[PDB]
Design a protein around this ligand. Structure first.
Ligand SMILES: O=C(O)CCC(=O)C(=O)O
Ligand code: NI
Length: 279
C-alpha cells in the first residue's frame, strides 16, 4: 500500500473553478482532507507585505503584535487576537479585529486585496457567498491573524473543533454549522527548514485528549498503539485543510529566517448556504 495518512489535493489557484464543491467534499462528504492551492497570491505581493512587517510601515499592524512572552520561549507571536484565546464578551478581540482589517488592507494595497482574494477562492470552491461574521452589536470578526514563528518556535498540537466547547464561541455558534471547521493559511515568508504543518490522522477526541496535561503526550501515546502528513506551502500558496477534525501542529522553525503566515478558519453557515471565515 502507498496510501498516505490523509488525502490532500494539490491544485493551482488558476484552477479553483474546476472544484466548485471542494468545501462540501471536505466537510460534508469527507472525500478528502485538505488541499494546497498554489499561487493564490503572487510571490511579489508576499515579499512586499513581509517587508511592511519587517520595516514597520505596516498600517499599525505592529500595534497589535502579541509577543506571548508570558507563555515561554517556544510559542508563536501573533498579530491580532485569535478568537480561541479570548473571553466570551470578545470586547478586546473585536477591537483588535478592527485594527487588523484596516492594517491588512493597507499593506496589500489592493494588489490583490487580501479579503477579496481569499473570498474569491472560497466562493470558487463552494459556489456560496462568503462573509466575515459580524458580532452581536455590529462588530467585525477578524478575517485572519498573522503568526510569526522565530527560530526555535513552534505551534503546539491542537485541534479546531475544541473551539466549540469554549465560551468564546458562544456567538459564532448561533451562526455556524456546528460540524467541522476548516483551517486556511498562506505563508508570507517561509523558513530555511522546519516550520512544517504536521496533520495527524487522529480525529477529534476531546474526552481522551483532556486526560493529558500536554496534548503532545496524547499524540505520542497513540503513536505507540504513516500516522501524519507534513506540508510546507511556499509563499502565496494556501493550505486549506480539515483542522477542525484532525489534530495538527507546526514544527519548530530551523534557521534565522522566520515563518510568517496569515490565515484563520472557515465553516458553513447553519443552513450551509454561506461560508464564514474568521480567526
Ligand atoms: O501556521 C499557521 O499559521 C496556522 C496552523 C494552524 O494551526 C491552522 O491553520 O489551524
Ligand atoms: Ni490550528
Amino acid at each position: 500500500s502507498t496510501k498516505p495518512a490523509l488525502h490532500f489535493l494539490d491544485i493551482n489557484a488558476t484552477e479553483v473553478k474546476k472544484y466548485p464543491t471542494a468545501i462540501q467534499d471536505i466537510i460534508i462528504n469527507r472525500s478528502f482532507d485538505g488541499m494546497i492551492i498554489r499561487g493564490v497570491f503572487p510571490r511579489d505581493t508576499m515579499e512586499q507585505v513581509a517587508r511592511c512587517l519587517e520595516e514597520g510601515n505596516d498600517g499599525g499592524m505592529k500595534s497589535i503584535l502579541n509577543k506571548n512572552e508570558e507563555f515561554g520561549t517556544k510559542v508563536a507571536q501573533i498579530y491580532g487576537h485569535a478568537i480561541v484565546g479570548q473571553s466570551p464578551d470578545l470586547k478586546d478581540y473585536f477591537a483588535s479585529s478592527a485594527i487588523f482589517r484596516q492594517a491588512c488592507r493597507t499593506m496589500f494595497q489592493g494588489s490583490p486585496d487580501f479579503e477579496e482574494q481569499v473570498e474569491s477562492i472560497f466562493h470558487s470552491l463552494s459556489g456560496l457567498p462568503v462573509e466575515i461574521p459580524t458580532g452581536p452589536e455590529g462588530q467585525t470578526y477578524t478575517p485572519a491573524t498573522i503568526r510569526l514563528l522565530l527560530e526555535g518556535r513552534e505551534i503546539a498540537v491542537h485541534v479546531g473543533n475544541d473551539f466549540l466547547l469554549m465560551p468564546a464561541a458562544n456567538h459564532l455558534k448561533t451562526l455556524l454549522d456546528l460540524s467541522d471547521q476548516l483551517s486556511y493559511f498562506i505563508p508570507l515568508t517561509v523558513p530555511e527548514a522546519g516550520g512544517e504543518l504536521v496533520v495527524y490522522s487522529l480525529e477529534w477526541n476531546p474526552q481522551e485528549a483532556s486526560k493529558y496535561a500536554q496534548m503532545q503526550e496524547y499524540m505520542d501515546d497513540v503513536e505507540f498503539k504513516s500516522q501524519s502528513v507534513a506540508y510546507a506551502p511556499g509563499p502565496g500558496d494556501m493550505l486549506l485543510f480539515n483542522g477542525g477534525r484532525y489534530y495538527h501542529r507546526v514544527s519548530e522553525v530551523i534557521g534565522n529566517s522566520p515563518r510568517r503566515t496569515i490565515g484563520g478558519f472557515l465553516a458553513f453557515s447553519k443552513q450551509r448556504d454561506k461560508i464564514y471565515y474568521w480567526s
